[PDB]
Design a protein around this ligand. Structure first.
Ligand SMILES: O=C(Nc1ccccc1N1CCNCC1)c1csc(-c2ccc3c(c2)CCO3)n1
Length: 257
């Protein structure tokens, strides 16, 4: 390889992510090293071409270790921009949300669902532009203009939609929309609303009962909270769609710090 692995960026179950620099052109990229299927991940990654999605540059196989070359995001994880119990300035949150929607609209437009949207997977470039990363759980939900219902159990509990826990088969799109809503909640309140959207989760029941005087809802302004009321809807068929999110008042509110 003509790429030098200069530093450990991410160390976790995903294997490992390193910063790689080309000792010739001096370009920098991220490298995910392994060494839940590389084949599918690469195949999905090859379809991606959007400013709010981590770009795929290629892959290399050496021994029993696969190398995924990806767009480097020096800004790191959105997760690290969320102050515990506080969140972040509403204008920053709105801007990141706008960028998140653009990325998701793009993926759904090509028939791909991410299935694990959360702040740890939303990266920022040098200009603080958001990029969706980690397509290890991503899958095709539309092919030849024919939608396929999902049934596989996956994602991250605090971020997963309730239908994924109750229904045998569910539509892909509303699930990603729900997780985006949980991300929005985290950005505005610096805390997750519930451990999981189950009948047995007190915090979730409180939300369904509109007990918005409780955390984290009490920390959120009326405008963004009204958007969250439309996104965090238990019945996926009644849940707001992205086209309608784009028409939301808070979504379209001019904001500045
Ligand atoms: O495609 C990427 N990652 C990526 C690809 C596949 C699976 C997982 C990941 N990561 C794991 C760590 N959290 C983010 C997703 C990628 C591209 S740049 C980058 C990155 C950049 C800076 C940084 C981190 C990751 C972690 C903290 O600082 N990660």
């Amino acid at each position: 390889e003509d790429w030098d692995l200069v530093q450990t960026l991410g160390e976790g179950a995903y294997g490992e992510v390193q910063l790689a620099v080309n000792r010739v052109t001096e370009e920098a990229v991220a490298v995910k090293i392994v060494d839940e299927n590389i084949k599918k991940e690469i195949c999905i990654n090859k379809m991606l071409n959007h400013e709010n999605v981590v770009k795929f540059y290629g892959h290399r196989r050496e021994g029993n270790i696969q190398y995924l070359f990806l767009e480097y995001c020096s800004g790191g994880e959105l997760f690290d921009r969320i102050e515990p119990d506080i969140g972040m300035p509403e204008p920053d949150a709105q801007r990141f949300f706008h960028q998140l929607m653009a990325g998701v609209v793009y993926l759904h437009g090509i028939g791909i669902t991410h299935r694990d949207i959360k702040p740890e997977n939303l990266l920022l470039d040098e200009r603080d532009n958001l990029k969706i990363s980690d397509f290890g759980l991503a899958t095709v939900f539309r092919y030849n203009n024919r939608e396929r219902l999902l049934n596989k159990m996956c994602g991250t509990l605090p971020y997963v939609a309730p239908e994924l826990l109750k229904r045998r088969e569910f539509h892909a799109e509303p699930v990603d929309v729900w997780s985006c809503g949980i991300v929005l909640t985290a950005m505005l309140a610096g805390e997750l609303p519930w451990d999981q959207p189950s009948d047995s989760c007190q915090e979730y029941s409180d939300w369904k009962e509109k007990k918005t005087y409780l955390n984290p809802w009490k920390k959120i302004d009326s405008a963004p909270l009204a958007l969250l009321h439309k996104i965090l809807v238990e019945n996926p068929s009644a849940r707001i769609t992205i086209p309608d999110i784009k028409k939301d008042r808070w979504y379209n509110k001019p904001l500045k710090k």
